[PDB]
Design a protein around this ligand. Structure first.
Ligand SMILES: CC[N+](CC)(CC)Cc1ccccc1
Ligand SMILES: [Mg+2]
Ligand SMILES: [Mg+2]
Ligand SMILES: [Mg+2]
Length: 340
């Protein structure tokens, strides 16, 4: 039973969950990978990894992905959670130098992952391994776009580091802009393409229906994370959360902020339903009788289907994952699964 304040009947009724058939193998393979890359200590991997549901989250999203593509995405995503944890810990412990160096190494590795496969920082080596594998699926033009997007993500994380160190809470619009980067909207959107086996031409992926459907899917995910992770984030002195920006710059109470975030989340769903019709119509138009047209149509249709799957995957992930279960921690400011 989902807590009343977080429950979204529309998701539960109109966005039925899906699960990729590779999930059982995926869960164990990512667990092994976390252990082999030493991204988490062995006993924490044993106690916590499965319960974190990181593979479940990706397997409920990129339906139809080749197993190897799903595996690389899942490893990358688990890495990404561990990076969020590292960033948090560096901030909490005032490790400005260690963060600066990691930030620099990630920019470098992103451009030449092969060279960093056995780097001394296991977090960098893990990143390089997943990124090298992601770069092996589609042409270099897709790789360059992924890299362009992720350079931007790294810098958003740096801005977060400085906000939290300088005690700054972003304004609401400032936050909403930053959140498209810290949640990595365009990375998850990029990864739809290797999942359906086709780098989409700019003309296709920048079609206003495709763009808007892709945006709304990610806005839902980010803002629903904000709604559900708010307790953990308040407990851990995190300042980046739509609710926190509203309490700060619009003078709402906690109750009022939760309500306003919920409303913005619900609106995302019905805005998506409307644009989804246009995106699927676009998918139909691409099927003009030609082989290429059919390829493009099928890929857009699969991608839009997965933009829809993201809603239900993110929704349930927040109620299933140990990551947000702050009520169960002895110290609410220090999640048990992070390296402190
Ligand atoms: C740190 C969390 N994460 C995933 C790695 C980084 C952008 C965003 C996210 C949170 C919850 C669900 C889905 C994505
Ligand atoms: Mg976080
Ligand atoms: Mg974060
Ligand atoms: Mg959060």
């Amino acid at each position: 039973a989902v807590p009343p304040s977080l429950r979204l009947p529309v998701i539960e009724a109109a966005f039925p969950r899906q699960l990729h058939p590779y999930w059982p193998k995926l869960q164990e393979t990512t667990r092994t990978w976390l252990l082999e890359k030493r991204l988490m200590p062995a006993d924490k991997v044993e106690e916590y990894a499965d319960g974190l549901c990181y593979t479940d989250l990706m397997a409920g999203y990129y339906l139809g992905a080749p197993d190897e593509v799903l595996q690389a995405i899942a490893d990358y995503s688990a890495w990404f959670f561990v990076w969020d944890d590292r960033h948090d810990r560096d901030i909490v412990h005032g490790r400005a130098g260690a963060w600066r160096r990691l930030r620099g190494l990630l920019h470098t590795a992103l451009d030449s992952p092969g060279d960093h496969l056995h780097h001394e920082d296991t977090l960098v080596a893990g990143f390089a391994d997943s990124v090298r594998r992601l770069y092996a699926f589609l042409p270099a033009t897709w790789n360059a776009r992924f890299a362009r997007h992720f350079h931007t993500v790294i810098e958003a994380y740096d801005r977060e580091f400085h906000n939290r160190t300088r005690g700054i809470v972003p304004g609401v619009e400032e936050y909403l802009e930053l959140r498209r980067l810290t949640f990595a909207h365009w990375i998850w959107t990029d990864l739809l393409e290797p999942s359906s086996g086709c780098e989409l031409p700019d003309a296709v992926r920048k079609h206003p229906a495709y763009r808007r459907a892709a945006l709304l899917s990610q806005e839902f995910g980010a803002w629903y994370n904000d709604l559900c992770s708010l307790p953990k984030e308040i407990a851990g002195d995190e300042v980046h959360n739509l609710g926190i920006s509203l309490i700060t710059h619009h003078s709402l109470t906690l109750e009022e902020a939760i309500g306003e975030v919920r409303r913005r989340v619900e609106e995302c769903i019905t805005e998506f339903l409307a644009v989804e019709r246009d995106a699927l119509r676009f998918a139909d138009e691409l099927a003009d009788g030609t082989v290429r047209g059919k390829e493009l149509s099928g890929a857009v249709r699969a991608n839009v289907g997965n933009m829809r799957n993201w809603f239900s995957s993110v929704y349930w992930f927040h109620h299933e994952s140990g990551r947000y279960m702050v009520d169960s921690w002895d110290d609410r400011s220090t999640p048990p699964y992070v390296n402190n």
